[PDB]
């Protein structure tokens, strides 16, 4: 591996520089909430949870309380861990629940109906992390988001454009959703103020009673009712049974650098490590960025990885994932030998690899 570059005055693109703390997010307001939290003495986890709650207000597109996700934490002392707060399918979920009368998947049911929802884990995930690795009480990291919800904030270009483009397809089709994000028959426009009184109440109750408010409190009741009255499956039992889970990160070594990422239920970590393992056999530096060869090699490596993804990946609590074989350097080497720098192998000739000799 060649020497690293933190950036110099001659570069075309310059990174933002700071000497103490830093936050990078998709939203200016959320980023500033994170920075204020660090300035107030909170650690990375505290700031991270504050940002997560802030985005649930300022970036309804993806920031959320009703979704799920993953968190990677690495302490100054080197301890690296992963937090799995991915949604859980309802207890009443069935294998063929999304198939029509002809046995064909109905995208409408898995994307726009009340059946498309998994039990939310974001609130549980943030509390598990805050409690064990944070230093601030939940109420303090939630407050910034609470104010944004209660007092409102200005709709910017990103939100206005997303409401118009993606929001128009689902938001106006639900009375409660329309009452919040639509105004005078149209989506909120740039410059308008978005106040979310109901969300502020939910946030206030979570800050006051803790995560139980969401999973066993008034919020859980509101979710279960929304489902029960509209053909959904999430019940109070589902919410009461949800649990965020701390898992061991998936990791590898690439030219002396150690890479840590998410383990199953995520496929990300495994395949990033696998692909890096494949690329390690090539002098990537030599070819350089934007070079036909570098792209050829990476394109091919990727094919083999996604092929395996379709076969061996799933919720580790239900299926055994051959992560050792998939991240095995010998296996990666065998894939690397199949890579022709001058001819691409059709996805038709590529199938999930045989892992037996690496297990």
């Amino acid at each position: 591996a060649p020497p690293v570059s933190y950036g110099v005055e001659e570069d075309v693109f310059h990174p933002v520089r700071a000497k103490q703390g830093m936050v990078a997010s998709v939203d200016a307001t959320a980023t500033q909430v994170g920075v204020d939290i660090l300035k107030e003495g909170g650690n990375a986890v505290d700031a991270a949870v504050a940002v997560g709650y802030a985005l649930a207000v300022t970036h309804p597109q993806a920031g959320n309380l009703g979704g799920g996700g993953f968190m990677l934490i690495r302490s100054k002392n080197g301890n690296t861990t992963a937090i799995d707060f991915r949604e859980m399918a309802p207890a009443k979920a069935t294998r063929d629940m999304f198939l029509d009368d002809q046995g064909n998947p109905d995208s409408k049911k898995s994307l726009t109906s009340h059946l498309a929802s998994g039990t939310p884990g974001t609130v549980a995930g943030f509390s598990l992390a805050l409690d064990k690795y944070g230093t601030m009480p939940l109420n303090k990291v939630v407050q910034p988001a609470f104010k944004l919800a209660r007092d409102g904030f200005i709709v910017n270009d990103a939100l206005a454009d997303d409401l118009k483009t993606y929001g128009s397809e689902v938001l106006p089709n639900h009375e409660n959703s329309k009452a919040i994000f639509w105004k005078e028959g149209e989506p909120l426009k740039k410059g308008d103020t978005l106040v979310q009184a109901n969300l502020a109440k939910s946030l206030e109750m979570i800050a006051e009673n803790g995560p139980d408010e969401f999973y066993k409190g008034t919020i859980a009741e509101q979710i279960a009712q929304e489902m029960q009255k509209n053909g959904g499956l999430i019940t109070k039992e589902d919410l009461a049974a949800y649990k965020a889970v701390e898992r061991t990160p998936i990791s590898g070594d690439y030219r002396g650098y150690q890479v840590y990422s998410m383990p199953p239920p995520s496929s990300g970590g495994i395949h990033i490590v696998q692909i890096l393992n494949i690329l390690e056999n090539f002098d990537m530096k030599k070819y350089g960025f934007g070079s036909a060869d570098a792209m050829q090699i990476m394109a091919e490596a990727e094919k083999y990885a996604y092929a395996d993804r379709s076969e061996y990946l799933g919720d580790p609590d239900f299926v055994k994932v051959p992560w050792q074989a998939l991240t095995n350097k010998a296996y990666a080497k065998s894939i690397a030998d199949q890579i022709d720098i001058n001819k691409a192998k059709p996805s038709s000739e590529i199938r999930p690899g045989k892992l037996a000799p690496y297990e």
């Binding site: 690293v4 700071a18 998709v26 009443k92 990476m298 799933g314 919720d315």
Partner: protein
């Protein structure tokens, strides 16, 4: 989906990627809670061999099941150099998350690009099925002709991802970069 990174004055780091799945999820708010509901169930394999919204496919491993967590591609990642946290990154993009994060790592380690350079560089992607080498605008016409000559099915498409990254110098200096692909994003420190 959205990703954010954080590094504090003590050197602790956190990378978080979370989502409702599609933009605004189902678009359904849960009663008077003001909370939007995810459509994460689409991440499950609805039927063996049938692709989902992102083109991903599965079988028994990722089949729908009670209390089961649907497979995700989200990849909050942290790279270590000389025993210390060095790169904190991640990105949204469903199936493309893997290759986007991969490129951030390669750009940083192999090409020696600073975090902003790595972030603003063009991206390409291949997920086996469909069988196409997806690319953003930014690659040389000459380079692209070679790839097609090699047999790649180059397809110029929409911008991919939204990396929010932080690189940590061994001396503690922090370097950050927000993806230009997302208007109104920001990386800031103190």
């Amino acid at each position: 989906t959205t990703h954010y990174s954080v590094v504090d004055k003590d050197g602790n780091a956190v990378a978080v990627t979370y989502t409702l799945n599609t933009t605004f999820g189902t678009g359904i708010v849960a009663g008077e809670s003001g909370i939007l509901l995810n459509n994460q169930m689409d991440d499950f394999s609805a039927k063996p061999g049938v692709p989902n919204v992102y083109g991903l496919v599965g079988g028994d491993a990722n089949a729908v099941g009670p209390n089961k967590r649907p497979l995700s591609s989200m990849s909050p990642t942290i790279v270590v150099k000389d025993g210390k946290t060095w790169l904190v990154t991640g990105s949204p993009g469903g199936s493309r998350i893997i290759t986007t994060v991969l490129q951030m790592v390669v750009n940083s380690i192999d090409y020696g690009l600073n975090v902003a350079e790595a972030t603003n560089a063009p991206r390409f992607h291949h997920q086996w099925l469909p069988d196409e080498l997806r690319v953003e605008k930014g690659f040389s016409p000459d380079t692209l002709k070679l790839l097609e000559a090699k047999g790649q099915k180059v397809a110029l498409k929409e911008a991919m991802g939204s990396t929010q990254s932080i690189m940590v110098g061994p001396d503690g200096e922090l370097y950050g970069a927000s993806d230009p692909r997302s208007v109104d994003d920001l990386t800031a420190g103190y």
